[PDB]
Design a protein around this ligand. Structure first.
Ligand SMILES: [Mg+2]
Ligand SMILES: [Mg+2]
Ligand SMILES: [Mg+2]
Ligand SMILES: [Mg+2]
Ligand SMILES: [Mg+2]
Ligand SMILES: [Mg+2]
Ligand SMILES: [Mg+2]
Ligand SMILES: [Mg+2]
Ligand SMILES: [Mg+2]
Ligand SMILES: [Mg+2]
Ligand SMILES: [Mg+2]
Ligand SMILES: [Mg+2]
Ligand SMILES: [Mg+2]
Ligand SMILES: [Mg+2]
Lengths: 226, 25, 50, 127, 97, 63
RNA sequence: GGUGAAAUUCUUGGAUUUAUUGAAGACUAACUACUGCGAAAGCAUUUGCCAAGGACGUUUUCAUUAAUCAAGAACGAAAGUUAGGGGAUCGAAGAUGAUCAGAUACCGUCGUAGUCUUAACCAUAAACUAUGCCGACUAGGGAUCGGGUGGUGUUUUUUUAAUGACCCACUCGGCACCUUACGAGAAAUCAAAGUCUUUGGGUUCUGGGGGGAGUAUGGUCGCAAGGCUGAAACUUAAAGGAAUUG
């Protein structure tokens, strides 16, 4: 497909990286690993103001690179660049995600999946949508081989999960919550309310996405990058 | 020929007859 | 159905317009009869795609 | 100690897209496709054609300076075949052996929640 | 004469089953009549590990696996080195190999 | 013009519709333990030494 | 991009590609199964409201109210019609590129009606289990859904109870299944397609060699498309069903 370009110009050389200068992404407070990585922006001219050209980027990282332990291998994290200064552009939490392989590996047939989500808002008015997933489990000594729910448990479990997610956000602004997903305390906490209903193995919560964010308030962001 | 098409061939034909008979009444 | 004294369309040995009925936006009063500055004509097919 | 990028490789039938990008994804480096290497239009997705494209993107990294790169294999996605093309993997082996550092290999092909409609009609592509 | 007791499918008491598209030729086909097979493979290769191991930081990273469910229409499945044809007596064996 | 020498450990079988090409999997002499499967045209044994103008493609192995 | 391979097509005005963000319409993936519901068409994201239904439990009530049904009525996939809304994607017609002896086709790129919804029509389908409905009896066995019963049984709470999830045994109803042929059948095959020459449990519908023909005509229903009811002349010794060997 090389010598087939019939026509180039409808109406009828400098290296782009000559004015490209690397920056550094600076993770928020509650992450043990700090150096996220580097970015590329072309040089800021008098009129271009490339310093403003990168406030909108969204950088992609994994907790395994943030906590350093493979136990968080999948645990996908989306960080949003918030303000740039002194080659050390500062980021903030944008949203959690699961890897594709992990999500497909959990879904085996001969069992019942339960999924749920809520649209709670935080103390600092951040609006978040938390998704929660679960799967049923075969009781030890089981003879029958499928272990489906009774479709009134799934109604009942979904009610309990939704209450828990609302509780765990409200009264928590943004970072304790960020430092709550890392230890997966919510994952363990939900299981406390379902064992009396149904086994419900494998409760890794889900992606959580951010919908609407409040005023910038330079000061609050400064707290994270102490 | 196929049964589907023979039934269709009749149907078009009954349109021609139902129209030419209308020239009279 | 009018005479050429009456309308841009008027007149003819048959009732016919004679020239395209799509008038420009820049025409003058007395020249703007018919469809004014039409982007398209004919029966509308498909969604408006506004 | 290593600068990253994202491989963002497009395994598909009829071509192969490989291009490292800055970790943000906005800034792009060395977008080379599989059709750029073979003037046959039939080997567009051939493993050898994909291999050549991967090397040049890997080769073009040193001049920029990026040394390591995350990998995101990605098929046609959507209501399409959803399975990576044969040039899909030969580029990946080409990227790793040419010197760059690989990390965080993942599949990112778009899967729908039972999307609109698949082309082909009711009886499909009769041949 | 009747060829099968289920005649094509596993529909007994269903009325209707809301078809799915064949993933090889897009031929529409009911879900229960399809030839569902699951395709799980190493994300890279059975041989690339000899190279993707050394060329990777984070030694022994995960070797993740891709997941996909493949529906096949009878016409494509028979043609595609799959279930193709068995003896009249062997048609009754439902045990997978 | 870089040239690599590869040695045959064993021959896997004959492929191609015609049946003239045989499937043989080899290893590079230098930088040993690096092995590859490639397709060869002429008569072959084990322990043969091949010359590859390129040493980077994974040949189609019939399986 | 597309393909067995190309061409039309979008491309230096920046395509395909990458990122952030927005809109719109449809669909309800993976879970998803010899699994569930419904009279049948049909029905798979969450919650709330509205009314319904079976099965089970029952030492509640009425007491033969029942079974099947001409006429008659309700619902009735898709396509199609009428009028607003909507109009993403796919796509009858149509326009194009290729193949070919030709290609008004299969392959490719576009694309109108249609697809969606509202209000009102249509009344058909391989509408299939090609197996009318109610009732009794005739062989075993595994498995599953719903309800129930018993088991110092396992599990989690509060080691501890009750529950919930499991395990064992049993039972009522359902979706099915596996072996056998006492029996049935032309046979393929059937736990009903058995209890039919040792021919009678009650009942509705349909059929009578192949073509002409589901045609003509006449009614009647429909906006129309068309539906339902429906011959005769004529012509013929075979059409057909299931298995066997080639
Ligand atoms: Mg047959
Ligand atoms: Mg049906
Ligand atoms: Mg562009
Ligand atoms: Mg179910
Ligand atoms: Mg769903
Ligand atoms: Mg009928
Ligand atoms: Mg019938
Ligand atoms: Mg009976
Ligand atoms: Mg059962
Ligand atoms: Mg029971
Ligand atoms: Mg049932
Ligand atoms: Mg008779
Ligand atoms: Mg007769
Ligand atoms: Mg026969």
């Amino acid at each position: 497909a090389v010598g087939k370009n019939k026509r180039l110009s409808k109406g009828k050389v400098v290296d782009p990286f000559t004015r490209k200068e690397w920056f550094d992404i600076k993770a928020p407070s509650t992450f043990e690993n700090r150096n996220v990585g580097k970015t590329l922006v072309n040089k800021s001219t008098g009129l271009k103001s490339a310093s403003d050209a990168l406030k909108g980027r969204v950088v992609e990282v994994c907790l395994a690179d943030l906590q350093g332990s493979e136990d968080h291998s999948f645990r996908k994290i989306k960080l949003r660049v918030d303000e740039v200064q002194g080659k050390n552009l500062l980021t903030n939490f944008h949203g959690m995600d699961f890897t594709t392989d992990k999500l497909r590996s959990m879904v085996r047939k001969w069992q019942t999946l339960i999924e749920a989500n809520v649209t709670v808002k935080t103390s600092d008015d951040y609006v978040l949508r938390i998704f929660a997933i679960a799967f049923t489990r075969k009781q030890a000594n089981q003879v029958k081989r499928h272990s489906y729910a009774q479709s009134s448990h799934i109604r009942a479990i979904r009610k309990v999960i939704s209450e828990i997610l609302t509780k765990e956000v409200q009264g928590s602004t943004l970072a304790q919550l960020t430092s709550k997903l890392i230890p997966e305390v919510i994952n363990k906490e939900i299981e406390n309310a379902t064992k009396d209903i149904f086994p419900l193995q494998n409760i890794h919560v889900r992606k959580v996405k951010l919908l609407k964010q409040p005023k910038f308030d330079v000061g609050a962001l400064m707290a994270l990058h102490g | 020929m196929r049964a589907k098409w023979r039934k269709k061939r009749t149907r078009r034909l009954k349109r021609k007859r139902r129209k030419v008979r209308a020239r009279s009444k | 159905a009018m005479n050429p004294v009456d309308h841009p369309h008027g007149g003819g040995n048959h009732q016919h317009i004679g020239k395209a009925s799509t008038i420009s936006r820049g025409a003058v009063s007395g020249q703007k009869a018919g469809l004014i500055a039409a982007r398209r004509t004919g029966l509308l097919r498909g969604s408006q795609k506004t | 100690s290593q600068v990253f990028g994202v491989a963002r490789i497009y395994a598909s039938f009829n071509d192969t897209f490989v291009h490292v990008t800055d970790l943000s994804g906005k800034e792009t480096i060395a977008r080379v496709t599989g059709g750029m290497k073979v003037k046959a239009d039939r080997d567009e997705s051939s493993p050898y054609a994909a291999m050549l494209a991967a090397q040049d993107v890997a080769a073009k990294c040193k001049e920029v300076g990026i040394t390591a790169v995350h990998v995101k294999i990605r098929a046609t996605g959507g209501t399409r075949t959803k399975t990576p093309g044969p040039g899909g993997q030969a580029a990946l082996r080409a990227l790793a052996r040419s010197g760059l550092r690989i990390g965080r290999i993942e599949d990112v092909t778009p899967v729908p929640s039972d999307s609109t409609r698949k082309k082909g009609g009711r009886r499909g592509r009769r041949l | 004469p009747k060829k099968r007791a289920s005649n094509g499918r596993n529909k007994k008491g269903r009325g209707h089953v809301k078809p799915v598209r064949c993933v090889n030729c897009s031929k529409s086909i009911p879900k229960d009549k399809a030839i569902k097979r699951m395709a799980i493979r190493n994300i890279v290769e059975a041989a690339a590990v000899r190279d993707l191991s050394e060329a990777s930081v984070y030694p022994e990273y995960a070797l993740p696996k891709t997941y996909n469910k493949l529906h096949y229409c009878v016409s494509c499945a028979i043609h595609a080195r799959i279930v193709r044809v068995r003896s009249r007596e062997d048609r009754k064996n439902r045990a997978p190999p | 013009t870089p040239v690599t020498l590869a040695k045959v450990i064993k021959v896997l079988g004959r492929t191609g519709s015609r049946g003239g090409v045989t499937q043989v999997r080899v290893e590079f002499l230098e930088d040993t333990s690096r092995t590859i499967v490639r397709n060869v045209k002429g008569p072959v044994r084990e322990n043969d030494i091949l010359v590859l103008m390129e040493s980077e493609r994974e040949a189609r192995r019939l399986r």
